[PDB]
Amino acid sequence: GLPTTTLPGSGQFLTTDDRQSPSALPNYEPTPRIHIPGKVHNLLEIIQVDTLIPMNNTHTKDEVNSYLIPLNANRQNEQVFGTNLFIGDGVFKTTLLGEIVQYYTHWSGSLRFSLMYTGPALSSAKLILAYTPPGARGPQDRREAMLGTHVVWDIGLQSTIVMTIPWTSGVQFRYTDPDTYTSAGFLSCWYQTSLILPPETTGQVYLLSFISACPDFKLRLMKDTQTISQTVALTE
Amino acid sequence: GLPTTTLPGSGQFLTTDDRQSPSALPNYEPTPRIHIPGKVHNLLEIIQVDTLIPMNNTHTKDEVNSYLIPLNANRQNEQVFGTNLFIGDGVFKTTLLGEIVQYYTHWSGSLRFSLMYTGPALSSAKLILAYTPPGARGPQDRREAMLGTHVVWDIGLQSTIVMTIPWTSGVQFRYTDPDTYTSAGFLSCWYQTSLILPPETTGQVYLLSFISACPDFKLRLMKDTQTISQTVALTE
Amino acid sequence: GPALSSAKLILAYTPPGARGPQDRREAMLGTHVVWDIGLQSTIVMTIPWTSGVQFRYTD
Amino acid sequence: INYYKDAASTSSAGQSLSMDPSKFTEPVKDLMLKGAPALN
Amino acid sequence: INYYKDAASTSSAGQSLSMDPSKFTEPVKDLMLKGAPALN
Amino acid sequence: TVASISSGPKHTQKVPILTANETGATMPVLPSDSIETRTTYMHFNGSETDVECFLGRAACVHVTEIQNKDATGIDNHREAKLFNDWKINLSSLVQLRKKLELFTYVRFDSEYTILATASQPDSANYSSNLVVQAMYVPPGAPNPKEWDDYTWQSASNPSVFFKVGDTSRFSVPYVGLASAYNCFYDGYSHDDAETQYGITVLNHMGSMAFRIVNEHDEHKTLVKIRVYHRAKHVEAWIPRAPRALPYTSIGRTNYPKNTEPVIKKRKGDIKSY
Amino acid sequence: GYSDRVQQITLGNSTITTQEAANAVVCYAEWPEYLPDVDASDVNKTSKPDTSVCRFYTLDSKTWTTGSKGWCWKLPDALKDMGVFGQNMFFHSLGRSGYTVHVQCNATKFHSGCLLVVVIPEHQLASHEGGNVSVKYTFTHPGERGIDLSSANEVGGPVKDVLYNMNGTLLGNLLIFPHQFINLRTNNTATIVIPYINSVPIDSMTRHNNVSLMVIPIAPLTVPTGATPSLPITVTIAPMCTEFSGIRSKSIVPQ
């Protein structure tokens, strides 16, 4: 008999431990693997795919319309939209990025924010997207927004503009859960010139906004999400 | 003393675990082995031996007659017999194949179904055996059966016809326990021409049917069978 | 038609043995070309020699 | 590694990996070739 | 060191370390170069 | 591994930030494509976001109950909870379900941990040392009818015997009939007008029965059983939209009627911060 | 002068052209292929009709109006009645196939609108009744007509809320699936090549729909002053690398 001394923790069940255990089905031969396209190895792989942002929260219920960012003709200087950058809440909470991000406590890296114009081909416009890094308020006019990271977007043949929100922070990681010290800043869009519609054309044109992560992205400290729950066990 | 940490599961008795244990009879010398014919290494070995199928269930009790498939003279087009292919139930349930198959949860492979004619030598007949793969109903006439896997059997000198039920499935394994998604199809037999008896010969001729597995066969996930039980422990 | 107009048509060739198609679905089942009207103004659809006998009468 | 002196105390043997059904499927005196008439 | 005979009983696999997002991010037929007009 | 390269001023015909999302592609645009950057390193591998790690921890997948009490006169042991069973499935408790449903097909080995805890709601002179028996009853195996059936002999079915208050642990190889488990299934068991729809017809894994081996004591003991599942040697295919609305049933994608909006509504403008 | 915008696809005796495309998507970057021996289970030699089934079939056109919610088709269901492909579908126990989906919708440089064209593998629909109600066979087998998301619920049918993808997930995240947009100002066609995706080598083509195709208006249709307030949308699908196995009687399916 090999002399041993059991240590504290013996008999405990740590849901996170990774040990060996006897197989209840010895000699069982599992089914052969066959090729299946679309294999996923890391969640960081899929958050690089962008999905639509319900930037237009404003409605009384979930609607296709919450994804449509309204643009108005012949408006100058004015603001198109705005939002803080707590990717684990607000407009981002239901996106694929926000959804996956909420399975972790910490995040870091650069975000990829895109805008696709859907107005008529014969219309034109120049908008300006701006990222205001933490430390100051969300910009209240174009001049203020323009002083920080921004992109002047000329609408045309190439329908989409991709503005990056470069990782701008002192501490190397932020909490996915909205935390002040760890705030990411603000995102806003303004009319650089203005939206011009062609003759016989009337009303509203919309912008579609997307969000995804850059290969920059890091996510850590896995945890349960606030995006799902139940009161009783489900039954068949 | 070697420091250790006991893990969850300690003290458990998994009937399926395979460990070492002290011998209660140290230095005991077991009896020498002698040669004994008929050694069995794998159950897949014996299910390749075919046994009789009680295809003729129809009786009020178990009888030699449930193994006799009646054949009638001067009948054209008509059906001789039919059965679904749930090898773990129905006609197959009591056969060696069905019996062994029920000790496992999953099965896959090809089945070997045979028919041996026992009518007089001077009689003749041509029958057609058909296998209808899953997705359609059991055939209701020869034309329908003939559209699928089949064998036209000419009765003669060689008394037995061996029709294979080739593994025809999408999913690579099926449940031995009758399950719809996992159904194997149908088996039927019809008169290709008809049974002709010679002069001074009268009545019924019978067919004997056999079932066995091809080397194709796979069986997995061992389990208890529904073919045996008791209410109280047996005594001497 | 005018440059600022648009259209998508489908040309179909129905080889012998069946009637002239009576609707798009029927025509679409045979040799065809979906033509997108645009910059290149002309669509060229070939009527490939589809026959058993190697020659036909002009009459 | 075996901790005990007796053979009986060791764990399971591991797949025989022999598998020859013929002693049960073809216990005939004269070899029968698949395809050749069973009764010549 | 593995204490059990079956593969299923071993512990976690360890980082795949493959990581190729392109099958989801760029599943396009004609390769698109960053910087080149998306629609030429 | 660099996180960002050094990148300076720019004035080109090459516009990396102008794309066409209607192509269906997400161009890999980087910060260095739109701003002047400095060199930084990743110092990160992404270990914790590997699917092996994501599904690689134990999650409670089922809670059930059995009890030790005099069986005398009980006509339905199952109903009396003299023994109980669980129609095995991983979509009853929502936390693990949402994770698994992040993919369409999933393949892995499973490590189970069963925790049994005792409870004596009314007058008892002591807590008894009960032994639980968890037996796996695959489709086709005879189901127990009485807490002390011949079925508990478990000659071929695998089963564990462990003390209440203790834990049971073992792993199971990938037992799917196909090459992978389906998290979703847009089909039926056969072409029938009334048959069930969804993975309900695919995930037919039998069930596991639990019972307390001990005979009854004077008092009654309530034993609660919790099953935990940990996936290992993971493979996942076809990522999908995460679940947004609450679940209503095991296996179906059904969501409750008159459900509340899941997307937050702004306390103000679309211009609000 | 080759462009991402101009394309030609020829399958069998059918050809498609488009002068306003936006490249083309190949699901998970994998082109369809036949079933290799190493992955096969079913021992039957398979049938490959080739050009007689691997050709473009055009479904009935849909009408996009200012109030359209979207449409949903299922494969192979949508082609269950298309020439020889359909016949083979019911005469065989098993089958496997890939497809080239081509959605068409043209307007003018004055119109505006944006359709999301996406392919969803194993799109298991939800019952509008909630609880544990099922969705009867017929309702997930609409055939060529497809399911109209703006139509009313019906007993035994699926929920049709565009916002929840008919399955309890949000519309905005449909982009994780191989998709493409038809943004009238840029586009006029969407093309998606679908490889066979399943957890089994081959499968029943009547009781299981491998993927469903959805055409969903995101940015609503907008027509110029006094113009017809509608636009037609046409869906053309061509099977590719189609294999059939286990030929027999021919299924008789619900309704």
Ligand SMILES: Cc1cc(CCCOc2c(C)cc(-c3noc(C(F)(F)F)n3)cc2C)on1
């Ligand atoms: C999806 C999905 C994947 C799975 C795998 C279920 C595994 O099913 C089991 C379980 C839960 C337990 C045992 C088992 N073997 O021994 C025991 C005992 F200890 F519980 F008896 N349980 C065996 C199988 C095949 O179920 N749904």
